[PDB]
Every structure is written in structure tokens, then in C-alpha cells.
RNA sequence: AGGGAAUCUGAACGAGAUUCCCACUGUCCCUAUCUA
RNA sequence: UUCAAAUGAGAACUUUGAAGACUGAAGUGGGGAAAGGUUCCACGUCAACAGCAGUUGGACGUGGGUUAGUCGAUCCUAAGAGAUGGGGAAGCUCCGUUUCAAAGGCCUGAUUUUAUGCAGGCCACCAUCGAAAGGGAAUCCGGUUAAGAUUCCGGAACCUGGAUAUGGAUUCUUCACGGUAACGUAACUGAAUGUGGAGACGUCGGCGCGAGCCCUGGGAGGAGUUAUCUUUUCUUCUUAACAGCUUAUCACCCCGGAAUUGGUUUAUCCGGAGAUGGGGUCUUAUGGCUGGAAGAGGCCAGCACCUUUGCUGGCUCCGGUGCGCUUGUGACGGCCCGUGAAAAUCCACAGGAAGGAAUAGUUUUCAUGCCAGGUCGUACUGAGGUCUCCAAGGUGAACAGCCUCUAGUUGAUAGAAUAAUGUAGAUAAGGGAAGUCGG
RNA sequence: AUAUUGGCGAGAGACCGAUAGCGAACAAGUACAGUGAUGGAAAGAUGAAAAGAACUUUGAAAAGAGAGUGAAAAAGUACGU
């Protein structure tokens, strides 16, 4: 996940099972003040949902990761 | 001498699952799924491939202009020009047989 | 394998072809039970599960099916 | 997504035909037009007339979807229904032969008021005075009318009364 | 990808203001059978598809790079 | 550029059957040796 | 199987290098449907299991791992199933699938003439489920991980739906014209209703054409063998989706009128219901050039290095060939009274309702421009014991074998002996069924 | 008044005492077996208190020998007798 932050400019979140791609794009844009290029989702083998949130070129995922708390 | 796999999930040799072995710019052979071939539109009266109409997938006719889907005559995009000719002749002479039958009918009534 | 997971009892006894559960009788409204199958009755009776609502009925009756709120003595 | 149906989206849910408006309201054409007169609702012109239809080039008038969709919940429509109930329940009394109960049905009759219908139409007073242009032209015509079987004398006397009130004020201030 | 064998058409595309970058590609090719020459390739990312311009001449290339808007980012090769 | 000839059976037959004539062989006289 | 080295307390069994073999494209190869459910990968580990062992694992413990507007499901219907209306049945529930059901969804209007209570018309079958191999809008190439790829990245695309904006057209103002014709076009309105095409369809045979594979000549690089002969053996020399022009058998149109019977196939059918001939039209199959695109991939070479340290130059070209194999397509000819699923979806014609001008007439199937595309599956395995796809070469008359290239294995307890017996296979003096019920 | 092997809640026994008493004193309607309906186990006790063996030595480690805790390891999770 930390590799995917730096290279592809992609934030990796654990999203709840009920929420779709519109709701992830809306959630990130609301909470983190950052526009989203695309969201890709997959159901994890354990039963939860992973989400690959790629941000637009005007925003950096490394900076926002240092902004929230995880690095 | 590269051997080649199916690309989509169907492992079977159906009508939809045809294969063209194509050489890629990576210097290797790989399969290409062949789109199911378009047919000629046909004469509704004749049963023959009518000239001047584009041959496309059914859905693919929506994108193209009306000048690729119709020839300029009456019954243009649906008939032959031979089958149009034949029904111009037929509708004329049937319409004139009606006149002759009225002439005979009016004459027989005058006789009675 | 003729059978797949049931929705009502989740026992994997929903016969695929017949489209019915051989254990609980889904989707016929009445849950399948027989007097000759007394052991089978014990496996699926009230009490085997959670009793989310039916636990507390005795408590509520003992109190006299009372509404409102306590008033701080 | 699945391939969306063509003629159900953009101009097809933005506008509706007269027939579709009448049917949706479950109201008579007359009463649809009566509410349309009161509410200040008019047909609107789309940029595509055939995309506003379901493909057809046809003689059609288009209303605004959200306008009719907003008319549906309204006290005046409910009061029109109440007038219809009153109409049959009166002719029940009259048609039988009892006159006293019919006369009593007149006493126990409320009517629709056009009070709240103006607040939503002309919210500011200067906006109402921008409409009074066309409003005073009807009313001053209807003062200068002989009463017929179409139009009762009470109607013309009340209209003339308002006319005289208007003339009195303009000559006052 | 689409061929435009048309000079001012390319220059109309460059001043669209929805265009960020351009590219000038240089090639080494030979005519008929005799002599080697230098080919240029003027490519813009258009509104939908990429438009390309083969100019076999070197002087017309020399004029065209000069004739581009100076604010536009130009890429060699 | 394995035989051959008869016969019993349904004139050749059919891996039909039997008998004989010719050839062949460890089946035997009589076993001996080698390899797996 | 062996030799060497590394790891470890410990090595026939772990790993690496070397030798020997085995599978020999009808693989012990690489993919999938089903099925399994984390077996995939890493680190830690040997308590139990993998019938010897083990430092190894399809084991154990802890973590990591499956990303889609274009691939599937999702949609449609098939054979069938199954509610509703009805009718049985003490009943659990069964019959029945359009039936003697009031099964509903659209248009017209100055507001409907005893005054503001809705009139007239159009259409006549029937919910739904049922396919991850049937029908179906649209995505490729290169790159990327310990493990994910048509899903991620870079590049380049396409489809569908929706608002709308501009240019062009609609001609002296009101729905364009050329061609004898087949038909051609940047457009060139078309309601109810009626119809047609695609979807959309049995099987084989030879023949034509195309793509991939195979064989090969020249040339531009590298690896090998060489005492001898050999311009030798091996390897690299690549071109995706999509896009712009262009390329055609068949079929049709005009001229022409034929026996002295002609044309013509591999296969004897074709012609006064118009042959040969002369001239044209059409579909874009499939090829060619161009763009994508050489900027990528490949083969080399030279120059820097504790180093997360790569850079700099080249070449990446020109051809040929077939009773070949694979596959795609075209025109024919047989085989039948066997006449060759359905539906969703898309297009077209007939029709002639309505609409269309003087401070933006009507119409956008013409060109350009804008936005958006949800959910679930996606890991891996898939080997007397379920289904399925791809398929190199040589010698030889050969589908006989024998040998190999690509790729993948070396797994199955080991070691020490080697007499008789037993099973199986050979050979044998002389004689030639004398054996045995019976070569 | 009467019935009441279910439910809610009590009180009792000349009853059984872990192969008994319910199938189940316990991760029991559990593990597991079966396509499925169903079938369906085994398994209680250290000590008063973990005080569950600090530390040293032998071994790659499990463990062993010392040492210690305890009234007792002739109670060391393989634990009452
Ligand atoms: Zn059940």
C-alpha cells in the first residue's frame, strides 16, 4: 500500500461493504478536501472491501498521507 | 512456434469464440478474438443482397449516415431495383385491369 | 452435489432441482417438523438460537407490562 | 452500466405532454386548466421537440415536469374533489324530493380560497403590482357587461365594486 | 490516430487553448533507392484523437517550428 | 522408368471342424546355460 | 541417479553449479469450464502430517495478496417451469397457463352551452423464472509485483446515454441534386398505421483467396565448433486495438442480338426469360500504403560502479516458395418429403399527420465541440478415477518407430550383497510330437 | 372443582454419583459422518493460595541434573487417590 501511495499516486482504504464507488469518491472529496481521478474496488478474501483511490495530478498522495497520520 | 491461449473466460470452441493468431509488437504471438462477421442486407421481395447498402453489425447501423443505409429510389433500402421494377409494372397493369372490368361491367348493366 | 445453502435455516439442504429445503421445508411457510423426528425437533427448537425478543417477555410480565420511566427516589 | 433506453432521459423527464399531465393528476381537463390558470402555469418550448416526445414529430404542447409534479400536492385540487362530492350529494337530496336537507347542505358548505395561491405566485408586493396590469383589464371589462345565463349579477356587482374601490383610491392619493 | 497532410490545420490545433503540449519527432529515412534524408513528424494530442503531420521537407519543418506559439511546450523526439 | 490334399458341416470360402501328406520347432527323449 | 559447493546441531532426500537421463507440442508444456476455498506469496517454524528422512512443503503460526464503461455475470429468450383468474382438496396444498377475469396504456380537446361534477377515440396477448458454452454495444500494445492483470501505470483507443454550443447545409426565401441505368452524395424534416432486413441458424466435398506456423535466398549483429573438410551450426532481425485512402469475386445495369451452336469449371452447367462480346455499377471481404510507431520491444557494442549507479552509440533491412499444417473467408457442387431455435436489440422502406421566416424561420441520420458510465466474480490448482483450447523440427515410401528444439521434470525409502527356487524372455548337439486326453 | 412429560418461577427426595444420572456435569446437540432426511460421540478433580519452578549447568532444542516454592512435587498442566 505504501509503495502504491508513492508510485501510482493511489490511496488505499478499507471501505465498508455497503458503500459503492460514487460514495467513496464523494467521501474522500468531502473529508480530505482532495479531488479523485478514479476509484477501483475489490472485495477482500476476509469479507471486507478494499478501495484504490487515485487522486488527480494536482494533488499528492504522499503529502495527504503525512497530513492524516499514516506513513 | 508459440502456442496460444484463449483470452476471454470461455474455454470452448463456440461460434462466438473464434481465434486469429496475431504477431504483436512485443515480438510474440497472441490470440485475437474475431468479431462475428457482418452480413449483407437482403431484398425483402427477392431474397438477394441489395446493392449500395453498407454491411455492418445490426447495432452498428445507428452510427452511420442515411446515405449508407438507403439507395435513392422508392423502396430503396429494402428492395432490388428489379423487384421494384416488377412491382411498378404489376401495380400499373392491375390498376388498368380494374378500368377494363368497370368498362365490361357498365356495358353488361346497360344490356340488362 | 444436489444440495446448496438454505436461506431460512442455512443448513445446505436446499435441493437445487426441486428448489426446496429438505430440512426446514423452504419456501413453504411452515417450518418442517415431524412428531416421529423428536431428535430433529430438539436441534431446531426455540432456545437453540438467540431468542432476541423472547428472552425478556418473562421479565416484562413480572413487572406487569409497564410503560413510562423510573422517577428517581 | 447496461445500455440505457434512448428516449426516456433528458428532455423526456424534463417535459410532459398535456395528456400525460391530465392523466398524472387524475383530474378533468377543465379542472387541470382551472388549476393552471390559478397557479400561473403555461406550456414551455424545448430545444428539441422530438426528444421531448418519445421520438415523434407530432402536434404536442409541453409542460414543465417539476411544475406539474409540484401542482399534485395542493389544497385547491383537494377542494375541487370536495366540490364534486358536494355536487352529487346535493342532487341526491334534490332528486329524491327532500328540500330541507339540501338547503342544509348549502349551510354546511365551505369553498376553496385563492389566498395561499398568490403567496407562492407573487411573494413580494411589487411583483403583484407587475401583474395588476393584466388583472385590471378583465375586471373593468366585466363591470361593463350585461348579466347573462353564463355570468350571474352577483359576479358583475362584486367586480364593479372592486373597480370602484380602485378608482376611488387612485383619485384619493 | 489520424493523418493530416495539411499544414495550417496543425497550426489551428496548436492554438486551441485546450492543448498543453506538442511534439516534434525526427526520423532518418531514405527516398526511392538512392539517398538518405530527414523526416519530421508534427503531432498534437487533439480534442479526441492524435493528429499527425508527415513533412518530408526539412525547410518547411524549419519554418513550422519557428511559426509555433512561443507559450506552447514543444518536445523534441 | 507354416504350407498342401481330402472329408464332416452353412465352387470358392469363413481365423468353422476333423483326418491325412509335406515342412518346422526343447512338447518330449533330456535337460543345459544366460539375461531381466 | 552421481559429482562438487553453500546452508544447518544434524544432509541419500534443502539449495546452487557440473554430469547423466525423462516427458518429446496426441507433452510430466502453457490455459480454461466444473470442482476445490487461500491450497497463491513471504517470513518465522518441525509440536502432529506429507507410511524412510527432512533444515522442505499442498503442513503449522503470523502477516501480504484478487483493482474493469469495453473480460464474464447482470439483459434476452429455448426446451421446460411457475404464480395470477378460476376449479379441486378435511387439509398440508394439487390442477390449470389464457383460460366465459372489469388483467391497461396511450392519444384527441378554446373548458365539456340550462353554465365551471370529463367527453370522444386507438390497440387486442397475457406476470415471471429458466444459458458464466446459445443471442449480446464497445480495449489493445508496451510496462509493472514476493504473489494482481485485456482490471494497475504510460501510451494510444472505442462504445453507449444525455444535455447543448458552433461551422456547414436546408435557396432567392419554406423538406438538396447528378447519373440512360445498376446507383452516387457532407447533409437533404416524415405522425398514426402497415411492412422488410440484420439478429437468424442442417451437414459434407472439392476448388479459389487471405492470415499465422513451417521451409528458404541475400544482408545487418551475437554465441559455437574447427588438425582435416565446411562462404559451417545455433540465435536476433518485431509491428496491437483502432483510424484515412485504396484493393473484388459474386451479383446487377446499358450497348449488343447468337446455330456453322458458343462460353466455361477441378467437378457440364450457362444462353432469345437475352449467351460470348463491348462498356459500366456495388458490397470492403480479406490484402497494400499511410498514421498509432518506433518514441515501444529485440540484438549488439562502448564507457562509469562500496554506492537505490546507469549513461552513450549503432543495427533493428531486403526477398522467395509450396499435393505442407492451423485457421479465417468466397464462389460452386452434392446429401433431404430431413426445408433447416427463439427473443432482447438495431436499422430500413411504404405511408403522408404535423410543422417551418423578415433585428437569429424549420430541420441536425453532415462536420466539430461537452459530460458521465453503478454491483458482484477476478488468487491458485485443475493430475482406473468429469468437460475443453493452443500444438516445433529431422531421417525414413510411412500416423512404424529412433533422435531432438520450445517448455517442464529428475518425484517414487535408501544402502549392501547377487546361491538355489519362482515369473518372464532367449539359445542349444542328435532325433523331430516319440510329450500329452488333445503340437 | 379437572388435565398439564411445554413455558415462566419456586420447593423438595430412603433417587443417580462421571461406563451411572439427560445424548450432553466439560469449546454438547459440539467434533464428526452422511447427497440429503438424519445419525451423533468421547471428554470432571494440581494446590488453601500459582506460590505454575527465579537462578546455575549439560544439550541444537524438547528436555536433564542441581536449586527453589509448597504441609506434601510419593501434587509439576502427561497434574487428587
Ligand atoms: Zn432450510
From Swiss-Prot, chain A:
Compartments where located: Cytoplasm
Keywords attached to this entry: Cytoplasm, Isopeptide bond, Ribonucleoprotein, Ribosomal protein, RNA-binding, rRNA-binding, Ubl conjugation
Entry GO MF terms: RNA binding; rRNA binding; structural constituent of ribosome
Positions of disulphide bridges: none
Annotated GO biological process: cytoplasmic translation; ribosomal large subunit assembly
GO cellular component: cytosol; cytosolic large ribosomal subunit; preribosome, large subunit precursor
Subunit structure: Component of the large ribosomal subunit (LSU). Mature yeast ribosomes consist of a small (40S) and a large (60S) subunit. The 40S small subunit contains 1 molecule of ribosomal RNA (18S rRNA) and 33 different proteins (encoded by 57 genes). The large 60S subunit contains 3 rRNA molecules (25S, 5.8S and 5S rRNA) and 46 different proteins (encoded by 81 genes). uL23 is associated with the polypeptide exit tunnel.
Function: Component of the ribosome, a large ribonucleoprotein complex responsible for the synthesis of proteins in the cell. The small ribosomal subunit (SSU) binds messenger RNAs (mRNAs) and translates the encoded message by selecting cognate aminoacyl-transfer RNA (tRNA) molecules. The large subunit (LSU) contains the ribosomal catalytic site termed the peptidyl transferase center (PTC), which catalyzes the formation of peptide bonds, thereby polymerizing the amino acids delivered by tRNAs into a polypeptide chain.
Curated annotation (Swiss-Prot), chain C:
GO cellular component, one term: cytosolic large ribosomal subunit
Record carries keyword rRNA-binding: yes
Cofactor: Zn(2+)
BP GO terms, sorted: cleavage in ITS2 between 5.8S rRNA and LSU-rRNA of tricistronic rRNA transcript (SSU-rRNA, 5.8S rRNA, LSU-rRNA); cytoplasmic translation
Zn finger intervals (C4-type): 6-24
Keyword rRNA-binding part of the UniProt annotation: yes
Subcellular location: Cytoplasm
Top-level lineage group: Eukaryota
GO molecular function: RNA binding; rRNA binding; structural constituent of ribosome; zinc ion binding
Binding site for Zn(2+): 6, 9, 21, 24
Cofactor stoichiometry and binding remark: Binds 1 zinc ion per subunit.
Sorted UniProt keywords: Cytoplasm, Metal-binding, Ribonucleoprotein, Ribosomal protein, RNA-binding, rRNA-binding, Zinc, Zinc-finger
Similarity-based family: Belongs to the eukaryotic ribosomal protein eL37 family.
The protein's assembly and partners: Component of the large ribosomal subunit (LSU). Mature yeast ribosomes consist of a small (40S) and a large (60S) subunit. The 40S small subunit contains 1 molecule of ribosomal RNA (18S rRNA) and 33 different proteins (encoded by 57 genes). The large 60S subunit contains 3 rRNA molecules (25S, 5.8S and 5S rRNA) and 46 different proteins (encoded by 81 genes).
Note: Present with 21800 molecules/cell in log phase SD medium.
Protein name: Large ribosomal subunit protein eL37A
Section of the entire sequence shown: 14 to 86 of 88
From Swiss-Prot, chain D:
CC annotations in GO: nucleoplasm; PeBoW complex; preribosome, large subunit precursor
Keywords for the protein's UniProt record, in alphabetical order: Coiled coil, Nucleus, Phosphoprotein, Ribosome biogenesis, rRNA processing
Molecular function, one GO term: RNA binding
Subcellular location: Nucleus, Nucleolus; Nucleus, Nucleoplasm
Taxonomy, superkingdom: Eukaryota
Keyword Phosphoprotein tagged: yes
GO BP term, pick one: maturation of 5.8S rRNA from tricistronic rRNA transcript (SSU-rRNA, 5.8S rRNA, LSU-rRNA)
Family: Belongs to the pescadillo family.
Function: Component of the NOP7 complex, which is required for maturation of the 25S and 5.8S ribosomal RNAs and formation of the 60S ribosome.
Description of how the protein assembles with itself and partners: Component of the NOP7 complex, composed of ERB1, NOP7 and YTM1. The complex is held together by ERB1, which interacts with NOP7 via its N-terminal domain and with YTM1 via a high-affinity interaction between the seven-bladed beta-propeller domains of the 2 proteins. The NOP7 complex associates with the 66S pre-ribosome.
Name of the protein this chain belongs to: Pescadillo homolog
Organism: Saccharomyces cerevisiae (strain YJM789)
Full-sequence portion shown in this chain: 1 to 173 of 605
UniProtKB/Swiss-Prot annotation, chain E:
Cellular location(s): Cytoplasm
Keywords associated with the record: Cytoplasm, Ribonucleoprotein, Ribosomal protein
Stored Gene3D superfamilies: 3.30.720.90
InterPro entries: Ribosomal_eL38, Ribosomal_eL38_sf
Keyword Ribonucleoprotein carried by entry: yes
Record-level GO BP terms: cytoplasmic translation; protein-RNA complex assembly
Major localization class: cytoplasm
GO molecular function: structural constituent of ribosome
GO cellular component: cytoplasm; cytosol; cytosolic large ribosomal subunit
Pfam families: Ribosomal_L38e (PF01781)
Highest rank taxon of the organism: Eukaryota
Record's subunit section: Component of the large ribosomal subunit (LSU). Mature yeast ribosomes consist of a small (40S) and a large (60S) subunit. The 40S small subunit contains 1 molecule of ribosomal RNA (18S rRNA) and 33 different proteins (encoded by 57 genes). The large 60S subunit contains 3 rRNA molecules (25S, 5.8S and 5S rRNA) and 46 different proteins (encoded by 81 genes).
Functional note: Component of the ribosome, a large ribonucleoprotein complex responsible for the synthesis of proteins in the cell. The small ribosomal subunit (SSU) binds messenger RNAs (mRNAs) and translates the encoded message by selecting cognate aminoacyl-transfer RNA (tRNA) molecules. The large subunit (LSU) contains the ribosomal catalytic site termed the peptidyl transferase center (PTC), which catalyzes the formation of peptide bonds, thereby polymerizing the amino acids delivered by tRNAs into a polypeptide chain.
Note: Present with 50200 molecules/cell in log phase SD medium.
Gene name linked to the record: RPL38
Amino acid at each position: 500500500a505504501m509503495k502504491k501511495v508513492e508510485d501510482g499516486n493511489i490511496l488505499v482504504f478499507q471501505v465498508s461493504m455497503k458503500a459503492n464507488k460514487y460514495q467513496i469518491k464523494k467521501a474522500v472529496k468531502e473529508l480530505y478536501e482532495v479531488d479523485v481521478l478514479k476509484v477501483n474496488t475489490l472485495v477482500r478474501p476476509n469479507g471486507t472491501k478494499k478501495a484504490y483511490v487515485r487522486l488527480t495530478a494536482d494533488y499528492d498522495a504522499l503529502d495527504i498521507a503525512n497530513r492524516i497520520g499514516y506513513i | 512456434a508459440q502456442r496460444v491461449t484463449f483470452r476471454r473466460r470461455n474455454p470452448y470452441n463456440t461460434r462466438s469464440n473464434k481465434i486469429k493468431v496475431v504477431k504483436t509488437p512485443g515480438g510474440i504471438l497472441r490470440a485475437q478474438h474475431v468479431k462475428k462477421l457482418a452480413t449483407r442486407p437482403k431484398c425483402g421481395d427477392c431474397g438477394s443482397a441489395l446493392q449500395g447498402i453498407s454491411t455492418l453489425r445490426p447495432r452498428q447501423y445507428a452510427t452511420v449516415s442515411k446515405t449508407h443505409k438507403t439507395v435513392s429510389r422508392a423502396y430503396g433500402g429494402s428492395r432490388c431495383a428489379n423487384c421494384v421494377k416488377e412491382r411498378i409494372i404489376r401495380a400499373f397493369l392491375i390498376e388498368e385491369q380494374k378500368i377494363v372490368k368497370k368498362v365490361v361491367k357498365e356495358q353488361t348493366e346497360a344490356a340488362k | 452435489k444436489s444440495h446448496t445453502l438454505c436461506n431460512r435455516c442455512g443448513r445446505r439442504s436446499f435441493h437445487v432441482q426441486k428448489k426446496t429445503c429438505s430440512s426446514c421445508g423452504y419456501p413453504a411457510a411452515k417450518t418442517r417438523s415431524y412428531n416421529w423426528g423428536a431428535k430433529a425437533k430438539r436441534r431446531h427448537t426455540t432456545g437453540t438460537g438467540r431468542m432476541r425478543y423472547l428472552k425478556h417477555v418473562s421479565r416484562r410480565f413480572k413487572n406487569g407490562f409497564q410503560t413510562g420511566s423510573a422517577s428517581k427516589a | 452500466m447496461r445500455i440505457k433506453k434512448k428516449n426516456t432521459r433528458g428532455n423526456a423527464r424534463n417535459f410532459i405532454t398535456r395528456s400525460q399531465a391530465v392523466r398524472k393528476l387524475q383530474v378533468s381537463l377543465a379542472d387541470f386548466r382551472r388549476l393552471c390558470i390559478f397557479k400561473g402555469i403555461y406550456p414551455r418550448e424545448p430545444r428539441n421537440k422530438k426528444k421531448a416526445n418519445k421520438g415523434s414529430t407530432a402536434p404536442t404542447t409541453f409542460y414543465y415536469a417539476k411544475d406539474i409534479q409540484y401542482l399534485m400536492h395542493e389544497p385547491v385540487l383537494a377542494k375541487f374533489r370536495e366540490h364534486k362530492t358536494f355536487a352529487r350529494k346535493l342532487t341526491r337530496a334534490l332528486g329524491r324530493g327532500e328540500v330541507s336537507s339540501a338547503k342544509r347542505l348549502e349551510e354546511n358548505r365551505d369553498s376553496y380560497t385563492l389566498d395561499h395561491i398568490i403567496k407562492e405566485r407573487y411573494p413580494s408586493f411589487p411583483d403583484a403590482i407587475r401583474d395588476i396590469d393584466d388583472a385590471l383589464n378583465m375586471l373593468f371589462l366585466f363591470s361593463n357587461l350585461p348579466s347573462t345565463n353564463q355570468v350571474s349579477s352577483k359576479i358583475i356587482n362584486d367586480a364593479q365594486k372592486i373597480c370602484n374601490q380602485w378608482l376611488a383610491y387612485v383619485a384619493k392619493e | 490516430a489520424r493523418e493530416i497532410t495539411d499544414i495550417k490545420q496543425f497550426l489551428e490545433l496548436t492554438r486551441r487553448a485546450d492543448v498543453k503540449t506538442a511534439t516534434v519527432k525526427i526520423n532518418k529515412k531514405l527516398n526511392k533507392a538512392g539517398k538518405p534524408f530527414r523526416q519530421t513528424k508534427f503531432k498534437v494530442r487533439g480534442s479526441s484523437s492524435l493528429y499527425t503531420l508527415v513533412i518530408n521537407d526539412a525547410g518547411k519543418a524549419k519554418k513550422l517550428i519557428q511559426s509555433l506559439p512561443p507559450t506552447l511546450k514543444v518536445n523534441r523526439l
